[PDB]
Design a protein around this motif. Structure first.
Motif, PDB file in Angstrom:
ATOM      1  N   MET A   1       2.819   1.463  -3.530  1.00 15.81           N
ATOM      2  CA  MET A   1       1.851   1.930  -4.500  1.00 15.81           C
ATOM      3  C   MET A   1       1.575   3.424  -4.409  1.00 15.81           C
ATOM      4  SD  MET A   1       1.258  -0.430  -6.524  1.00 15.81           S
ATOM      5  CE  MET A   1       2.766  -1.385  -6.311  1.00 15.81           C
TER       6      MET A   1
ATOM      7  N   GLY B   1       5.669  -8.721 -12.898  1.00 13.82           N
ATOM      8  CA  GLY B   1       5.045  -7.423 -13.138  1.00 13.82           C
ATOM      9  C   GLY B   1       5.928  -6.270 -12.684  1.00 13.82           C
ATOM     10  N   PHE B   2       6.662  -6.467 -11.585  1.00 17.34           N
ATOM     11  CA  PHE B   2       7.571  -5.431 -11.081  1.00 17.34           C
ATOM     12  C   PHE B   2       8.872  -5.367 -11.844  1.00 17.34           C
ATOM     13  CE2 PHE B   2       5.075  -6.211  -7.147  1.00 17.34           C
ATOM     14  CZ  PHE B   2       4.496  -4.947  -7.072  1.00 17.34           C
TER      15      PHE B   2
ATOM     16  N   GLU C   1       0.821  -1.212   0.000  1.00 14.62           N
ATOM     17  CA  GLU C   1       0.000   0.000   0.000  1.00 14.62           C
ATOM     18  C   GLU C   1       0.862   1.273   0.000  1.00 14.62           C
ATOM     19  OE1 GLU C   1      -4.494  -1.113   1.721  1.00 14.62           O
ATOM     20  OE2 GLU C   1      -2.849  -1.021   3.168  1.00 14.62           O
TER      21      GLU C   1
ATOM     22  N   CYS D   1      -1.052  -5.156 -13.990  1.00 13.96           N
ATOM     23  CA  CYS D   1      -0.952  -5.862 -12.712  1.00 13.96           C
ATOM     24  C   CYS D   1      -2.280  -5.828 -11.951  1.00 13.96           C
ATOM     25  CB  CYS D   1       0.195  -5.313 -11.866  1.00 13.96           C
ATOM     26  SG  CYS D   1       0.681  -6.287 -10.395  1.00 13.96           S
ATOM     27  N   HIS D   2      -2.916  -4.654 -11.886  1.00 17.98           N
ATOM     28  CA  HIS D   2      -4.176  -4.483 -11.143  1.00 17.98           C
ATOM     29  C   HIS D   2      -5.310  -5.395 -11.633  1.00 17.98           C
ATOM     30  CE1 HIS D   2      -2.599  -0.147 -10.197  1.00 17.98           C
ATOM     31  NE2 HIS D   2      -2.040  -1.044  -9.407  1.00 17.98           N
TER      32      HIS D   2
ATOM     33  N   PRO E   1      -3.001  -9.244  -1.080  1.00 15.96           N
ATOM     34  CA  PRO E   1      -4.334  -9.651  -0.585  1.00 15.96           C
ATOM     35  C   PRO E   1      -5.111 -10.666  -1.432  1.00 15.96           C
ATOM     36  CG  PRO E   1      -4.080  -7.298  -0.310  1.00 15.96           C
ATOM     37  CD  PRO E   1      -2.846  -7.773  -1.028  1.00 15.96           C
TER      38      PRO E   1
ATOM     39  N   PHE F   1       3.620 -12.353 -10.427  1.00 14.09           N
ATOM     40  CA  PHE F   1       3.281 -11.123  -9.725  1.00 14.09           C
ATOM     41  C   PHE F   1       4.580 -10.336  -9.544  1.00 14.09           C
ATOM     42  CE2 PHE F   1       3.191  -9.166  -5.440  1.00 14.09           C
ATOM     43  CZ  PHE F   1       2.226  -8.180  -5.633  1.00 14.09           C
TER      44      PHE F   1
ATOM     45  N   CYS G   1       1.152  -0.568 -14.936  1.00 15.38           N
ATOM     46  CA  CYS G   1       0.328  -0.322 -13.751  1.00 15.38           C
ATOM     47  C   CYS G   1      -0.990  -1.102 -13.862  1.00 15.38           C
ATOM     48  CB  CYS G   1       0.062   1.187 -13.548  1.00 15.38           C
ATOM     49  SG  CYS G   1       1.534   2.247 -13.212  1.00 15.38           S
TER      50      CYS G   1
ATOM     51  N   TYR H   1      -4.436  -8.898 -10.406  1.00 13.18           N
ATOM     52  CA  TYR H   1      -3.923  -9.148  -9.057  1.00 13.18           C
ATOM     53  C   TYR H   1      -4.426  -8.280  -7.896  1.00 13.18           C
ATOM     54  CZ  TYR H   1      -0.618 -12.625 -10.935  1.00 13.18           C
ATOM     55  OH  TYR H   1      -0.066 -13.747 -11.508  1.00 13.18           O
ATOM     56  N   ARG H   2      -5.298  -7.315  -8.178  1.00 14.86           N
ATOM     57  CA  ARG H   2      -5.798  -6.412  -7.137  1.00 14.86           C
ATOM     58  C   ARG H   2      -7.037  -6.985  -6.467  1.00 14.86           C
ATOM     59  NH1 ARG H   2      -6.332  -0.846  -9.065  1.00 14.86           N
ATOM     60  NH2 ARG H   2      -5.996   0.685  -7.388  1.00 14.86           N
TER      61      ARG H   2
ATOM     62  N   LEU I   1       4.447   5.172  -5.865  1.00 16.19           N
ATOM     63  CA  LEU I   1       4.414   5.063  -7.330  1.00 16.19           C
ATOM     64  C   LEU I   1       3.453   6.085  -7.927  1.00 16.19           C
ATOM     65  CD1 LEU I   1       4.406   1.167  -8.022  1.00 16.19           C
ATOM     66  CD2 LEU I   1       6.366   2.680  -8.149  1.00 16.19           C
ATOM     67  N   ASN I   2       2.246   6.120  -7.368  1.00 15.32           N
ATOM     68  CA  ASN I   2       1.139   6.928  -7.871  1.00 15.32           C
ATOM     69  C   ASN I   2       1.350   8.435  -7.730  1.00 15.32           C
ATOM     70  OD1 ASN I   2      -1.757   6.411  -8.950  1.00 15.32           O
ATOM     71  ND2 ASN I   2      -2.078   7.939  -7.337  1.00 15.32           N
TER      72      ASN I   2
HETATM   73  C1  HEC Z   1       2.028  -5.581  -9.769  1.00 18.88           C
HETATM   74  C2  HEC Z   1       3.092  -6.083 -10.441  1.00 18.88           C
HETATM   75  C3  HEC Z   1       1.764  -4.107  -9.661  1.00 18.88           C
HETATM   76  C4  HEC Z   1       2.285  -3.042 -10.414  1.00 18.88           C
HETATM   77  C5  HEC Z   1       3.306  -3.080 -11.536  1.00 18.88           C
HETATM   78  C6  HEC Z   1       1.685  -1.865  -9.928  1.00 18.88           C
HETATM   79  N1  HEC Z   1       0.779  -2.177  -8.951  1.00 18.88           N
HETATM   80 FE1  HEC Z   1      -0.447  -0.816  -7.921  1.00 18.88          FE
HETATM   81  N2  HEC Z   1      -1.123  -2.243  -6.880  1.00 18.88           N
HETATM   82  C7  HEC Z   1      -0.817  -3.557  -6.950  1.00 18.88           C
HETATM   83  C8  HEC Z   1      -1.579  -4.313  -5.938  1.00 18.88           C
HETATM   84  C9  HEC Z   1      -1.516  -5.809  -5.694  1.00 18.88           C
HETATM   85  C10 HEC Z   1      -2.338  -3.414  -5.275  1.00 18.88           C
HETATM   86  C11 HEC Z   1      -3.307  -3.647  -4.128  1.00 18.88           C
HETATM   87  C12 HEC Z   1      -2.482  -3.710  -2.830  1.00 18.88           C
HETATM   88  C13 HEC Z   1      -3.164  -3.209  -1.575  1.00 18.88           C
HETATM   89  O1  HEC Z   1      -2.886  -3.789  -0.498  1.00 18.88           O
HETATM   90  O2  HEC Z   1      -3.961  -2.235  -1.573  1.00 18.88           O
HETATM   91  C14 HEC Z   1      -2.033  -2.120  -5.889  1.00 18.88           C
HETATM   92  C15 HEC Z   1      -2.681  -0.994  -5.404  1.00 18.88           C
HETATM   93  C16 HEC Z   1      -2.507   0.239  -5.952  1.00 18.88           C
HETATM   94  C17 HEC Z   1      -3.214   1.408  -5.548  1.00 18.88           C
HETATM   95  C18 HEC Z   1      -4.323   1.503  -4.491  1.00 18.88           C
HETATM   96  C19 HEC Z   1      -4.035   1.914  -3.035  1.00 18.88           C
HETATM   97  C20 HEC Z   1      -5.236   1.534  -2.174  1.00 18.88           C
HETATM   98  O3  HEC Z   1      -6.164   2.357  -1.915  1.00 18.88           O
HETATM   99  O4  HEC Z   1      -5.316   0.374  -1.705  1.00 18.88           O
HETATM  100  C21 HEC Z   1      -2.754   2.410  -6.357  1.00 18.88           C
HETATM  101  C22 HEC Z   1      -3.207   3.857  -6.318  1.00 18.88           C
HETATM  102  C23 HEC Z   1      -1.756   1.861  -7.218  1.00 18.88           C
HETATM  103  N3  HEC Z   1      -1.645   0.508  -6.987  1.00 18.88           N
HETATM  104  C24 HEC Z   1      -1.047   2.562  -8.188  1.00 18.88           C
HETATM  105  C25 HEC Z   1      -0.086   2.001  -9.058  1.00 18.88           C
HETATM  106  C26 HEC Z   1       0.636   2.757 -10.036  1.00 18.88           C
HETATM  107  C27 HEC Z   1       0.474   4.241 -10.294  1.00 18.88           C
HETATM  108  C28 HEC Z   1       1.485   1.888 -10.692  1.00 18.88           C
HETATM  109  C29 HEC Z   1       2.426   2.123 -11.838  1.00 18.88           C
HETATM  110  C30 HEC Z   1       3.029   3.321 -12.078  1.00 18.88           C
HETATM  111  C31 HEC Z   1       1.237   0.566 -10.066  1.00 18.88           C
HETATM  112  N4  HEC Z   1       0.312   0.727  -9.120  1.00 18.88           N
HETATM  113  C32 HEC Z   1       1.916  -0.592 -10.441  1.00 18.88           C
HETATM  114  C33 HEC Z   1       0.076  -4.204  -7.809  1.00 18.88           C
HETATM  115  C34 HEC Z   1       0.834  -3.525  -8.729  1.00 18.88           C
END
Ligand code: HEC
Ligand code: HEC
Ligand code: HEC
Ligand code: HEC
Ligand SMILES: [Ca+2]
Ligand SMILES: [Ca+2]
Ligand SMILES: [Ca+2]
Ligand SMILES: [Zn+2]
Ligand SMILES: [Zn+2]
Ligand SMILES: [Zn+2]
Ligand SMILES: [Zn+2]
Ligand SMILES: [Zn+2]
Ligand SMILES: [Zn+2]
Ligand SMILES: [Zn+2]
Ligand SMILES: [Zn+2]
Ligand SMILES: [Zn+2]
Ligand SMILES: [Zn+2]
Lengths: 106, 106, 106, 106
Positions: D7, D64-65, D4, D101-102, D46, D61, D98, D105-106, D10-11
């Motif tokens: 992320m 993705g990074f 969290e 992955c979401h 999660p 997963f 970005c 995997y989100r 990153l954002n």
């Molecule tokens: C996997 C290889 C990912 C990459 C590449 C990026 N993100 Fe991600 N992001 C990932 C997961 C598994 C999650 C959920 C984790 C959690 O416990 O919440 C996220 C979550 C975000 C969020 C949300 C924050 C929240 O309110 O929970 C944001 C705003 C976000 N990610 C932004 C983001 C950006 C801008 C990325 C690239 C530049 C990016 N993520 C890459 C997994 C992965």
């Protein structure tokens, strides 16, 4: 060849990958895709039929093609791994690279 | 070009880089090498002339070129960075790839 | 953990690939090298203690770890395909990045 | 740091890039994206708490990074080169990774 064949070649193989049943096609499709981007590295495009070979618009046009080869080189590892779906994902995800160059240079 | 032609191209410019005064001599050399790299992997090296295009030996032969192509690209960013020096050491470093492919597939 | 700590896991996990029999161990070493290279990219080396976090050489120092990392990333993809021989020769090529860094800042 | 946090970094560091005046801002914004992306590699998510460290979902997963770093790795040279416009374009291109992955995997 002509830039347009290369581009059509890239594009055709994208759909081929969209539609592809398994690794077999994805693999050759990407093999096909990679020769063409490589073939396109060297061309001097319609919009930049103007400036000379070494300038910040013929360098950045050319750099867009290495982004492309690396991403083809990644999916092809994924396509090799027996991971069709996650390699077809990678194939979809190069559309972003297709478009970036297009936006400045087409 | 055929395989040998590209391979002299690769060696002639690897030499250029070693003596180059400035970044511009590096950039142009590395620009020649990249195309020589991506031309070269469309070839069938004599050592594997027998084997099918789709074969473990031949997919590995081609993979070596992406490694060279990735390297030249990075090396070429350092040439666009005005950093004359570190581009040469980066280019020198890629002799490892050259050697590795030659150790197995020549 | 710290630089001297991180370099041993690199140096040791390098040694485990060189002798390995199957993928898992190699896959296994490669991912700690990356974490070890994840961990090590942030640190400050004794030769650059005087230097600011925005210095040229500290940027050039973090750069080395990406190259090292980018190779680990590809070296992992061949292991994932089960290609044990290739993954051992790829890991072997990492020494070239190891050695490039040490000339400059070790 | 955690996922969290990483992320968030990153954002926010991206949005900093979108709105940038100069190159040393983008240099610094991308560097913190790289620190955070490096650091998120070891976090378990999660959706994949249930999944094992060496498993298809977690290996893919962590991959993705690995992509994202490369695009981050590459974004810096444009920036480093004072190439603001096209460094921002490489930052807009991160969104495809970005999003990728979401969805999975989100
Ligand atoms: C996997 C290889 C990912 C990459 C590449 C990026 N993100 Fe991600 N992001 C990932 C997961 C598994 C999650 C959920 C984790 C959690 O416990 O919440 C996220 C979550 C975000 C969020 C949300 C924050 C929240 O309110 O929970 C944001 C705003 C976000 N990610 C932004 C983001 C950006 C801008 C990325 C690239 C530049 C990016 N993520 C890459 C997994 C992965
Ligand atoms: C720049 C570095 C490019 C990349 C990367 C890709 N494309 Fe391209 N494309 C580019 C230019 C400059 C042009 C114009 C050529 C012209 O007609 O003047 C194109 C064109 C196309 C076309 C249309 C060809 C035509 O007959 O008009 C298609 C269908 C196309 N491009 C597809 C395509 C795809 C699928 C790509 C990624 C896989 C891609 N292009 C990358 C420049 C660049
Ligand atoms: C495989 C992936 C290769 C890489 C990377 C490089 N080289 Fe190569 N090289 C390769 C082969 C199979 C051959 C044999 C060609 C033949 O059929 O005889 C070569 C050969 C050369 C030669 C001599 C050509 C000849 O007379 O046989 C040179 C001078 C040479 N290669 C240089 C070279 C350099 C400088 C490279 C990296 C920058 C390089 N090679 C990479 C296969 C591969
Ligand atoms: C910079 C970008 C580096 C890369 C890539 C690698 N190493 Fe390194 N290494 C680096 C520094 C600055 C130092 C000295 C820092 C310190 O205070 O210790 C080192 C040190 C080592 C050592 C010495 C450990 C000891 O016995 O005291 C080893 C054995 C070592 N490094 C190994 C190593 C290997 C195997 C690498 C590639 C796989 C590698 N290093 C990369 C900087 C950098
Ligand atoms: Ca000869
Ligand atoms: Ca000729
Ligand atoms: Ca938290
Ligand atoms: Zn990958
Ligand atoms: Zn000839
Ligand atoms: Zn000839
Ligand atoms: Zn001839
Ligand atoms: Zn010659
Ligand atoms: Zn680089
Ligand atoms: Zn210690
Ligand atoms: Zn590879
Ligand atoms: Zn953390
Ligand atoms: Zn680049």
């Amino acid at each position: 060849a002509d830039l347009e064949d290369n581009m059509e070649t890239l594009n055709d193989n994208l759909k081929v990958i969209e539609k592809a049943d398994n690794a077999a096609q994805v693999k050759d499709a990407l093999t096909k895709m990679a020769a063409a981007a490589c073939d396109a590295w060297s061309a001097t495009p319609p919009k930049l039929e103007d400036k000379s070979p070494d300038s910040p618009e013929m360098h950045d046009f050319r750099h867009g093609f290495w982004i492309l080869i690396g991403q083809i080189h990644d999916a092809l590892h994924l396509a090799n791994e027996g991971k069709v779906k996650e390699a077809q994902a990678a194939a979809e995800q190069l559309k972003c690279t297709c478009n970036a160059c297009h936006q400045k240079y087409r």
